[PDB]
């Protein structure tokens, strides 16, 4: 019935392929310098007077954090040394003066046609135990969930995004706010199912016919302003191996 909220512009299903090339792969800067990170889109991201480029920061063992939405809008709580610019196909993230806590990997991401990500830029200044999560055999199945609180869950589109061991981010499912519409990339269509409970505030991902290439950290994530992914739940790692 009523209009629902979606995770990407092209997902809108009621009346009312884009590659991101991110450069450089890594950046070594000194405290207080300017860091400049570039993202070129294979198609324009301009739509209806907006431009659907978002930028995220991610530190090891943590979910990505929204920095910039709609190309140039600074997310609340992010310091103003972060800025974004660009339109159409050419986008830039600038950080100046860089601080020590800004060492991280940065990703661009577009929400004009599904959700796709740049390959990332590791920003460095000047013993590890790594979680494999749940071990599954190929062909097996698994179900993940997330809960939500502190906001009206039923008003927001939700997604699952996974991160491979190579640190690539890949969108794997979206569901509209009222759960009427679901969306998947070809890589998982027919095997993964996203669902939600708007009475108890849960999001689910059912994964079946698991493949080795489904090995990844899986994040549940909310779509906020202008199709940015503004809150990411902590990840659940899945290792598919014989």
What does this structure look like?
By secondary structure, the chain is an all-beta fold. It folds into two domains: 108 residues, Immunoglobulins (Immunoglobulin-like, Sandwich); 105 residues, Immunoglobulin-like, CATH 2.60.40.10. It is 0% helix and 46% strand. The protein contains no helices and 23 strands. The strands form five sheets. Strands 2, 6, 7, 8, 11, 12 and 13 form a seven-stranded mixed beta sheet that branches. Strands 14, 16, 17, 18, 21, 22 and 23 form a seven-stranded mixed beta sheet that branches. Strands 1-3-10-9 form a four-stranded antiparallel beta sheet, with no helix packed on it. A hairpin with a 3-residue loop joins strand 7 and strand 8. The chain starts with 19 loop residues before the first strand and ends with a strand.
Structural class: mainly beta
Order of helices and strands: EEEEEEEEEEEEEEEEEEEEEEE
Total individual domains: 2
CATH superfamily of the largest domain: Immunoglobulins
CATH level-3 fold name of the largest domain: Immunoglobulin-like
Q: Could you estimate the helical fraction of the residues in percent?
A: under 10%
What is the tally of beta strands? 23
The main sheet comes to: 7 strands, mixed
What's the helix and strand layout?
Layout: E1 20-23, E2 26-29, E3 35-41, E4 46-47, E5 50-51, E6 53-58, E7 65-69, E8 73-74, E9 82-87, E10 90-95, E11 104-110, E12 116-117, E13 121-125, E14 134-136, E15 142-147, E16 158-163, E17 169-175, E18 182-183, E19 192-197, E20 202-207, E21 216-223, E22 229-232, E23 236-240
Parallel strand pairs: 2-13, 14-23
Antiparallel strand pairs: 1-3, 3-10, 4-5, 6-7, 6-11, 7-8, 9-10, 11-12, 11-13, 15-20, 16-17, 16-21, 17-18, 19-20, 21-22, 21-23
PDB class: immune system
Keywords: antigen binding, affinity maturation, somatic hypermutation, immune system
Assembly: monomeric
């Amino acid at each position: 019935g009523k209009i629902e909220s979606y995770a990407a512009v092209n997902h809108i299903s009621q009346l009312s392929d884009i590659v991101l090339t991110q450069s450089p792969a890594s950046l070594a800067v000194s405290l207080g310098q300017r860091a400049t990170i570039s993202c070129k889109a294979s198609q324009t991201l301009d739509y209806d007077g907006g431009t659907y480029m978002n930028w995220y920061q991610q530190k090891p063992g943590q979910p990505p954090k929204l920095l910039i939405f709609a190309a140039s809008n600074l997310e609340s709580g992010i310091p103003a040394r972060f800025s974004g610019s660009g339109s159409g196909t050419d986008f830039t993230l600038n950080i100046h003066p860089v601080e020590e806590e800004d060492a991280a990997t940065y990703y661009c991401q577009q929400s004009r046609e599904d959700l796709t990500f740049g390959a990332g830029t590791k920003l460095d200044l000047k013993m590890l135990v790594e979680s494999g999560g749940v071990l599954v055999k190929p062909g097996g199945s698994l179900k993940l969930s997330c809960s939500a609180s502190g906001f009206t869950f039923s008003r927001y589109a939700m997604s699952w995004v996974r991160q491979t061991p190579e640190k690539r981010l890949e969108w794997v499912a979206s569901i509209s706010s009222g759960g009427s519409y679901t969306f998947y990339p070809d890589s998982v269509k027919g095997r993964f199912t996203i669902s939600r409970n708007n009475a108890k505030n849960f999001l689910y991902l059912k994964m079946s016919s698991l493949r080795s290439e489904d090995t990844a950290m899986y994040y549940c994530a909310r779509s906020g302003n202008d199709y940015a992914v503004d809150y990411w739940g902590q990840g659940t790692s899945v290792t598919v191996s014989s």
